[PDB]
Structure formats: structure tokens, C-alpha cells
Design a protein around this ligand. Structure first.
Ligand SMILES: COc1ccc(S(=O)(=O)Nc2cc(C(=O)O)ccc2F)c2ccccc12
Length: 136
């Protein structure tokens, strides 16, 4: 197989900034103790592409997680904060758009490349958070 545009995401990334994530987590419904421990974490994110399958791994002192998915195809995800969600990830103009659905709720996480960074923007009921990763 040849190159794909989404190979721009591939690599090893480290969190360098996080803005408003506590208020986002409150809107998502994350409990106090999990918010405090999860907000401290400075994860590494490892993204790989193999054929049609994209794999996103996160490693941190809080939790290790791994999702593998095909664009546009719904999957089951257990999130780092222990929600059991239905997830669908698509590519819209270079941006990975990830919708998580659970318990009648929904949140959207966008991942995009900007300069040498990977920018993660999430939104829940009007509350947004921005988390920025750099190459590790
Ligand atoms: C480290 O505590 C977490 C790790 C991951 C998730 S999430 O469900 O994967 N969504 C997500 C991930 C990122 C990221 O990886 O930076 C940025 C914004 C997000 F909404 C969490 C979701 C809720 C609370 C804590 C989470």
C-alpha cells in the first residue's frame, strides 16, 4: 500500500498543554477522584496506520488505552474514565472526527495536525477543551 493523508498523524506524541479539561470532564460526568487523577496525567499517544485500520494508543500514569478502528465504522470503546461508549471516527478535511455516544449523551473529539503539533479539541454541551501534543 502507498501513503495516505492520515499518515500525518502517525508517530509518538507527548502531551504538552491542556486547557479547560477539568470543566470538560465535569460536563461529561466524570467523578471527582477520576477528574483529579486523570487531569494530572501527561500521556503519550502512539498512532499507527496499517491498511484500513488506525490504532491510537495512549500511555500514562492514569491509564493505558488502545483503540483500533476503520473510518466510518462504529466500534465499542471503554474510555480512560471507564465509560462504555459507542464510537465512530471519520476523516473530514484532514481532521479525525470522533463521536462518543453513551447513556443518551454525546461528545465530539477532533484530532488535527497543526504545525508540528497534534491538537485535540473536544466538546461536550458547549464546553470545549484543547489538548496539545508534540512529537516525543
Ligand atoms: C486522561 O484522561 C482521559 C483520557 C482520555 C479520555 S477520552 O475518552 O479518550 N477523550 C479525550 C481524549 C483526549 C486525549 O487523548 O488527550 C482529549 C480529549 C478527550 F475528550 C478521557 C475522557 C474523559 C476524561 C478523562 C479522559
Amino acid at each position: 500500500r502507498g501513503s495516505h493523508m492520515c499518515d500525518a498523524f502517525v508517530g509518538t506524541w507527548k502531551l504538552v498543554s491542556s486547557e479547560n479539561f477539568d470543566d470538560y470532564m465535569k460536563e461529561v460526568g466524570v467523578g471527582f477522584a477520576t477528574r483529579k487523577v486523570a487531569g494530572m496525567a501527561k500521556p503519550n499517544m502512539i498512532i499507527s496506520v496499517n491498511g484500513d485500520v488506525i490504532t491510537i494508543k495512549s500511555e500514562s500514569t492514569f491509564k493505558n488505552t488502545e483503540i483500533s478502528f476503520i473510518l466510518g465504522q462504529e466500534f465499542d470503546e471503554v474510555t480512560a474514565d471507564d465509560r462504555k461508549v459507542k464510537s465512530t471516527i471519520t476523516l473530514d478535511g484532514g481532521v479525525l472526527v470522533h463521536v462518543q455516544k453513551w447513556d443518551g449523551k454525546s461528545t465530539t473529539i477532533k484530532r488535527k495536525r497543526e504545525d508540528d503539533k497534534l491538537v485535540v479539541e473536544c466538546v461536550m454541551k458547549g464546553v470545549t477543551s484543547t489538548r496539545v501534543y508534540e512529537r516525543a
